[PDB]
Design a protein around this motif. Structure first.
Motif, mmCIF file in Angstrom:
data_model
loop_
_atom_site.group_PDB
_atom_site.id
_atom_site.type_symbol
_atom_site.label_atom_id
_atom_site.label_comp_id
_atom_site.label_asym_id
_atom_site.label_seq_id
_atom_site.Cartn_x
_atom_site.Cartn_y
_atom_site.Cartn_z
ATOM 1 N N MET A 15 2.354 0.021 -2.149
ATOM 2 C CA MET A 15 1.696 0.914 -1.204
ATOM 3 C C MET A 15 1.451 0.234 0.137
ATOM 4 O O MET A 15 1.645 0.847 1.187
ATOM 5 N N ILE A 101 -6.233 -1.406 3.410
ATOM 6 C CA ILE A 101 -5.831 -1.271 2.017
ATOM 7 C C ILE A 101 -6.091 -2.581 1.312
ATOM 8 O O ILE A 101 -5.732 -3.643 1.822
ATOM 9 N N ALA A 103 -5.633 -4.323 -2.584
ATOM 10 C CA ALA A 103 -4.974 -4.143 -3.869
ATOM 11 C C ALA A 103 -5.039 -5.420 -4.682
ATOM 12 O O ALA A 103 -5.101 -6.526 -4.139
ATOM 13 N N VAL A 108 -4.119 -0.617 -6.378
ATOM 14 C CA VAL A 108 -4.889 -0.451 -5.144
ATOM 15 C C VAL A 108 -6.330 -0.098 -5.496
ATOM 16 O O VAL A 108 -6.579 0.879 -6.207
ATOM 17 N N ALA A 111 -8.389 2.335 -0.309
ATOM 18 C CA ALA A 111 -7.511 2.778 0.756
ATOM 19 C C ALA A 111 -8.363 3.562 1.738
ATOM 20 O O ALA A 111 -8.948 4.584 1.370
ATOM 21 N N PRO A 162 -6.804 5.128 -5.038
ATOM 22 C CA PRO A 162 -5.730 6.030 -5.479
ATOM 23 C C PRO A 162 -5.648 6.051 -7.002
ATOM 24 O O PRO A 162 -5.805 5.016 -7.644
ATOM 25 N N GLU A 168 -1.074 7.608 -4.097
ATOM 26 C CA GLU A 168 -0.651 6.546 -3.180
ATOM 27 C C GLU A 168 0.267 7.127 -2.110
ATOM 28 O O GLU A 168 0.098 6.875 -0.917
#
Ligand SMILES: C=CC1=C(C)/C(=C/c2[nH]c(/C=C3N=C(/C=C4\NC(=O)C(C)=C4C=C)C(C)=C\3CCC(=O)O)c(CCC(=O)O)c2C)NC1=O
Length: 243
Positions: A15, A101, A103, A108, A111, A162, A168
């Protein structure tokens, strides 16, 4: 602004990769000039007692955007970060594009994306409100509430975990839509009055001051580089207060 030779890109969450590519694609054909970060920063690594933090910076400007900063980062093997802000030239009164973002090995976790106001009334310009409304309200299963300092973000701010690949991709597409609106509005914006320029500068100053209250960023930086480095980085590299 090619990401083709980035050392971090190949190892970043998918992503983050797609978003980095989308941001670079949005900027690629603009009237770009380099923006020299403090100490002409481009790549940096640090470690203290724990994991190493590795950072790649790309930074540009145009007549409408004071500073366009895309920063990729990785802590150790598994924690991945994308930071991006387009700081507007106050003369044109455009909002602030921003996204973040975060992760890990579990996917993730955060976001965030927004076009953030600079006007004294804390509203986006009418044209942005209109274009953003027309995108419709996106559906996300795991909404997250902004921290108090997040009052700076617009009513259109996204802040989610997400839930799956579909989300995503929905989030990335919405960022693409935000950038398309932003780039278009930039070409119809005219220079504003001294009083209006002043207003907008203050909106941008406030945005930076509030972003510096984010201890989630600060702790990551501090664990790798220490307190003084983190303070200089947040105040001078990420969220520089214009003056
Ligand atoms: C530059 C280095 C950089 C680091 C080290 C960084 C770390 C980082 N930011 C985070 C959250 C966050 N990040 C933001 C938002 C932003 N943050 C921004 O830099 C910008 C431009 C926005 C918004 C446009 C918000 C709102 C949170 C949640 C804060 C919280 O939960 O308290 C988190 C917590 C993730 C989670 O709770 O799942 C970490 C570790 N972000 C970074 O950008």
């Amino acid at each position: 602004l090619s990401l083709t030779n980035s050392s971090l890109m190949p190892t970043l969450n998918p992503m983050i990769q797609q978003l980095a590519l989308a941001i670079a694609a949005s900027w690629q054909s603009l009237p770009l000039k380099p923006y020299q970060l403090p100490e002409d920063l481009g790549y940096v690594e640090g470690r203290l007692e724990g994991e190493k933090l590795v950072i790649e910076n790309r930074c540009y400007q145009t007549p409408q955007f004071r500073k366009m900063h895309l920063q990729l980062a990785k802590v150790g093997k598994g924690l991945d970060i994308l930071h991006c802000v387009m700081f507007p030239e106050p003369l044109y009164g455009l909002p602030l594009f921003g996204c973040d973002i975060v992760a890990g090995p579990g996917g993730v976790s955060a976001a965030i994306a927004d076009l953030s106001p600079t006007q004294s009334d804390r509203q986006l310009p009418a044209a942005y409100q209109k274009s953003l409304a027309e995108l419709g309200q996106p559906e996300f299963e795991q909404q997250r509430e902004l921290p108090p300092w997040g009052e700076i973000f617009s009513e259109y701010c996204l802040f989610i975990r997400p839930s799956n690949v579909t989300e995503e991709e929905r989030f990335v597409q919405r960022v693409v839509d935000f950038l398309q609106i932003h780039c278009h509005q930039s070409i119809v914006a005219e220079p504003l009055s001294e009083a209006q320029t002043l207003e907008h500068r203050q909106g941008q100053i406030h945005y930076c001051q509030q972003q510096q209250k984010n201890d989630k960023t600060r702790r990551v930086l501090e664990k790798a580089f220490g307190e003084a480095w983190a303070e200089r980085y947040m105040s001078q590299v990420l969220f520089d207060v214009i003056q």
